[PDB]
Design a protein around this ligand. Sequence first.
Ligand SMILES: [Mg+2]
Ligand SMILES: [Mg+2]
Ligand SMILES: [Mg+2]
Ligand SMILES: [Mg+2]
Ligand SMILES: [Mg+2]
Ligand SMILES: [Mg+2]
Ligand SMILES: [Mg+2]
Ligand SMILES: [Mg+2]
Ligand SMILES: [Mg+2]
Ligand SMILES: [Mg+2]
Ligand SMILES: [Mg+2]
Ligand SMILES: [Mg+2]
Ligand SMILES: [Mg+2]
Ligand SMILES: [Mg+2]
Ligand SMILES: [Mg+2]
Ligand SMILES: [Mg+2]
Ligand SMILES: [Mg+2]
Ligand SMILES: [Mg+2]
Lengths: 158, 50, 62, 208, 167, 300
Amino acid sequence: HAAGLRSGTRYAFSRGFRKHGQIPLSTYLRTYRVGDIVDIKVNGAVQKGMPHKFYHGKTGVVYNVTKSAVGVIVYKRVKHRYIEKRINVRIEHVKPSRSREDFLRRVKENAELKKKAKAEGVPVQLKRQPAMPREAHTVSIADNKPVTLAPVAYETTI
Amino acid sequence: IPPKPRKILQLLRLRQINNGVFVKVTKATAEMIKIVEPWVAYGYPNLKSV
Amino acid sequence: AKSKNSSQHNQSRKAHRNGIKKPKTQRYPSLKGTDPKFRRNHRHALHGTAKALKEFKEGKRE
Amino acid sequence: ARRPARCYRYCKNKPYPKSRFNRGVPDPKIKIYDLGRKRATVDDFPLCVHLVSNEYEQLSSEALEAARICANKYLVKYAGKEGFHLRVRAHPYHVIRINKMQTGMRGAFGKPQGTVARVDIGQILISVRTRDSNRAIALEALRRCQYKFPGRQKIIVSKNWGFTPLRREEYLEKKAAGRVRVDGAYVQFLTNHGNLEENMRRFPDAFK
Amino acid sequence: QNPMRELRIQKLVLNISVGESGDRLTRAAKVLEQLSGQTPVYSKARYTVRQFGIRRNEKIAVHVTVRGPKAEEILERGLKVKEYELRRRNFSETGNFGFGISEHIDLGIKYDPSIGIYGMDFYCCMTRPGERVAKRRRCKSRIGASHRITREETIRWFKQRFDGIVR
Amino acid sequence: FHKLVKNSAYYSRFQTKFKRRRQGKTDYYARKRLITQAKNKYNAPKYRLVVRFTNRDIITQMVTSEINGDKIFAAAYSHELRAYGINHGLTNWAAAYATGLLLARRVLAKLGLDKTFTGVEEPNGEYTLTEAAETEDGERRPFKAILDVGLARTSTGARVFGVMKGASDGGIFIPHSENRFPGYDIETEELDTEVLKKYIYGGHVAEYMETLADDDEERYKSQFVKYIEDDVEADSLEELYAEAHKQIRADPFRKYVSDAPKKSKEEWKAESLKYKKAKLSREERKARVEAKIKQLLAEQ
RNA sequence: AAAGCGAAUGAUUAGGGACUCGGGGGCGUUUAGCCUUCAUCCAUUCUCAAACUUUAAAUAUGUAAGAAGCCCUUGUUAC
RNA sequence: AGGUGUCCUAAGGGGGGCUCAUGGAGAACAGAAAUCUCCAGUAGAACAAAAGGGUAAAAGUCCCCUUGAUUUUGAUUUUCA
RNA sequence: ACAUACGACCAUACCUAGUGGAAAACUCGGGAUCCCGUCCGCUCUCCCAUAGAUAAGCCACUAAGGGCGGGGUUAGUACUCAGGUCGGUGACGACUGGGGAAUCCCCCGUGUUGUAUGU
Ligand SMILES: [Mg+2]
Ligand SMILES: [Mg+2]
Ligand SMILES: [Mg+2]
Ligand SMILES: [Mg+2]
Ligand SMILES: [Mg+2]
Ligand SMILES: [Mg+2]
Ligand SMILES: [Mg+2]
Ligand SMILES: [Mg+2]
Ligand SMILES: [Mg+2]
Ligand SMILES: [Mg+2]
Ligand SMILES: [Mg+2]
Ligand SMILES: [Mg+2]
Ligand SMILES: [Mg+2]
Ligand SMILES: [Mg+2]
Ligand SMILES: [Mg+2]
Ligand SMILES: [Mg+2]
Ligand SMILES: [Mg+2]
Ligand SMILES: [Mg+2]
């Protein structure tokens, strides 16, 4: 048996059905800054700057920006500890991450909520709550007569 | 006991048999209780019980 | 004689015994592996910023 | 010859079909799956009966061939050589190996011994389509042929028309509506989604 | 009515497949050069030609194509030998046609034993104006189904323009 | 007999190419390298002087690439040389040079660097590139753009390089060599410059006019009928193009109005809508299906 | 995992519709004469894959949920 | 089920023009297969070598020019302590 | 709204067949001195914008079109996580607390949009 660099990447590194050929150029048109959070997804058509198969499907933080690639910090679990790994990835294997979009939209929503609450004199709720049990309510059967169901007898269908 | 139910029971503070706790029903707590269902009996207390 | 070849049976429990240590993050990360041109410029940018901050207390008054 | 079928009754591994990795596989014992008047039209044989597995097990090609021979002989002698159509619907694609006894368990991967059909609960093993007057003959033929199989099998009279996937009533109404055309020993159905002229010339009675 | 659908001769490609390289192939190239007024080109062998003991990459044929009035007159001289008589098999379903002469000396060329005697194959490719749509580099595209030539149309054009007979 | 290749399975598994590539308009291999900016330069725009040729026009654009589509910084056309005096040969090398100069001046005026970076005022065939300019703030590097030839071939003496030379003389720094200008001799690796000046001022067209008038007067009249009608002589082409360059530099925003009918945007929208054919509805298609069924049945 | 093969690759059971011939063999010979037996093609059909797949779960897995944050203004640099 | 101890001045680097396997029609010798022409042709070809990915104005093929198969020392990735 | 150039998504855009197309644009088009390249000005390159035509490209519409896309149905089915001193000789199955597919089949649709210059 073998332990080469791209062992077991038959499907992960492959391009999807009817997804071959030309690479969209918005990938190259994107810009990245140090501290940005990016998702790593290996493009099989770009053999330069390929990250190892472990980092495929991982999310990290950009720590270095270069001509055609970014340095990403990932944390890899080995034995009983976490190791900080730094990988140089070409842009084609890097996608900006929505892993923080909810928080980044909540921070500004909370800012406007705070200023509006201060203006209006009544505090509002800034922190999200988990789904709560449903409240009491009344269901009218007017024009919604219940339909009585019974278990069906067994019969063969072949 | 498997480690995930063990951790959930530790977080619910049910570390010993015949231990009991009050829990406010939310989605977050209900999912944990559902996971540790094979180890707990739970229900809706009345004023006398409380 | 023959024996067992390999096993990962107890490794997860051994790892979790004292926790999985994740190195704590710091406010200022190391500039190791950063683009050397950027590092060379950043050195002098920091030099000038410190000089301007000292002149601000000494009379520059920005 | 071969090991008793007890040794290969239960599917304890992944399928092992004959292929470019598995060469040297002997031919299956069963080679004929259709018997009787297999050229008969759909309307000729409305009644259908299935011998169906009730277990998840492996059926040998030798057992399939023996059951086919028994059922075919009974049907030919009683319902006539032109009064039925019998289809064996289990195909032995899985290759079972033997480690013929360097020595001991060293290098124990075996050479191909034979072929076997993996069947599920509710999987149809044999089907017979015939006239409604041959119901008892078909039932008895299937019951006799089931003695050649391991495990439990059930004889179920299909509610469909022959080998078509349509019940008797819906098949009859679809045929009356001109929506069914006769192919060789089978039928084709109008779809109302093709070229209009082609559909009209293929199903003329459906547009009257 | 046909505004811009008049059939024109796109080109006339004529070739001699000698089957072997050497002096005879060079002489075939020479006769083709003096016929066309242009230097021809040689065709390699793509596979193991057991017919004449060839394996690969050996000159076995020479050919040249002509366009315009020179092509028209050369093809007319070829159908002089063929007596304007062609079989219906000679017309392709696309709209082109062709024919072979067993010896070239019955054309407007004087016999010379130094170069020998060669037959050759003429093939006329027809077109309508606007075929550049399928051959230009930028915005290359197909031609419409109604604008392509039909075997019957080519036969009729041949009959009308050359007064020829098709059997 | 004949296995049908283009069946339902073939259609289902067919992967279409990019729409622009199917249209045969964009070379995405070249585009990637043309528009991709170094990541450590962030949002610094990469400016493309894109040049395209139609049967009757020359299109020159200063373009930047954004994530959701390109942005036209400035555009110049061979249409607009009529406002500066050129009325014939709008797709020749002289017109290409003139429209490149017009686009260069337009871009410099738009971005406020026209007083500086004048380029060369009097063109010549010398191979030069716009250098940095001195000012009260010190040295300032010229505005930079790179040529985008599309699918056109970059052979020696091409009008794409004509437009590039025009813009370079206008004052935009375009990195380029000289081994593709007309008059460059590949065998000696030298630029004549005088052939280049001739091509810049359209002298090749004038010499063609003279040769045609001397040899074949009928073909000369047929080819240059509009030149005869406007009594534009071969010798006047050089001064006409020089005056066009002077006027282009004097007023890069001169407005040209064409002879085509002119309406408002709303008027054009209404007129175009008048000729728009509407799609059939589902019920209309169903009714047509029933009508066709009945007609075909009545036929047989 | 499941699912699929009137979807690619590969395996596989049966008949139909025609082709004109595509191979062979004939009947009343350059007669596209009239037949036949296969082959091809076509729209259907029974059954499959650890080293097949258009699809595609459950379990499990990466990241985030602020003060080292957010907003405004303007200082440094040799990039 | 298989592969490796090699092989390549190009089968490395850059640029450009072209589009392959195959099928259907056609053209003297010429036919099942030699060359020529057109039309279809999602890659069913090719890319040194196993297999799997990847590639169509290319990563294939032909042509032109070359030696980034160069100098210096670090950083990082996999196997991993 | 229509056209062109440069695009974004990359078939709702592809493929086949038929019909129609104001204005302008685009196109086919004409010539081969010069620049340039071919066996051949076929392609590429240059020159003309006169003439001819929307025949083709292009655009639009049509087709119980193939394909594609969306939805339903398949189906709470297949499958699967956790549970029992559950059933069954077994193969395997049912139940409890959860998650939950994919064909065939049916219905609908056949591009959206940015910048700039124009009609
Ligand atoms: Mg030992
Ligand atoms: Mg040991
Ligand atoms: Mg300790
Ligand atoms: Mg025994
Ligand atoms: Mg290029
Ligand atoms: Mg499976
Ligand atoms: Mg299949
Ligand atoms: Mg298959
Ligand atoms: Mg599998
Ligand atoms: Mg998932
Ligand atoms: Mg998750
Ligand atoms: Mg081995
Ligand atoms: Mg290579
Ligand atoms: Mg090379
Ligand atoms: Mg190369
Ligand atoms: Mg190339
Ligand atoms: Mg491939
Ligand atoms: Mg050099």
